[PDB]
Amino acid sequence: MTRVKRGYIARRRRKKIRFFASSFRGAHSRLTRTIAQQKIRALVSAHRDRDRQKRDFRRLWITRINAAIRERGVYYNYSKFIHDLYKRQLLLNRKILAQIAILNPNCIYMIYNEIIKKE
């Protein structure tokens, strides 16, 4: 059955898959199949890294402080630290706000003396 002639139609269905493939190391950007198995990866992993992006930092923040705990005095855990604020009443200074360690370590030094007084 003489189709309606794919012509340019089936031409756009492949090049569009190539435009997306313009930053890959391997030859997964110069073939519909090599990219077919490539896009799916960036089609599944993408659906993951999007939710993993939050977890990826969940360990970071804790690690950021962890490296800052092995110097002060509370060699115990940063948990007791969080416990102090919890039992206290500070809904601030979150895992993200833990950036006070690196820059201006003078502010993060105050809470260090406020956690001991509470507990």
């Binding site: 089609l43 993408a46 009443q89 601030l92 979150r94 706000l97 006070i100 502010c107 105050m110």
Partner: protein, 104 residues
């Protein structure tokens, strides 16, 4: 000033002089001023720490820079057991802020 406001579920340490792509602010129109008295941390010399939720005095002031979904990230997924390829674009007005007043 080290301020910790609330976007509804997010609490960044938005340092004065930088913008933050907040969520949707139906209460605030384009090029409108917004105030969040829900700030927790405060600069002023030593990092002050209030007791009861949020702060009782002072607040944050700034002006939104128009709302828009910026760039359609277009999230998606995939399955092996069965060919299931679908694409969906997420809007998110990512309303940016501003602020400038900085302090220790």
């Amino acid at each position: 000033i080290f301020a910790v406001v609330v976007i509804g579920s997010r609490q960044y340490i938005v340092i004065p002089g930088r913008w933050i792509y907040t969520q949707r602010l139906k209460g605030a129109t384009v090029n409108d001023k917004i105030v969040l008295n829900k700030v927790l941390l405060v600069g002023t010399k030593a990092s002050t720490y209030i007791g009861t939720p949020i702060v009782t005095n002072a607040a944050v002031h700034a002006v939104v820079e128009e709302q828009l979904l910026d760039d359609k990230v277009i999230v998606f997924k995939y399955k092996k057991k069965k060919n299931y390829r679908r694409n969906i674009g997420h809007r998110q007005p990512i309303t940016r802020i501003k602020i400038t007043g900085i302090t220790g």
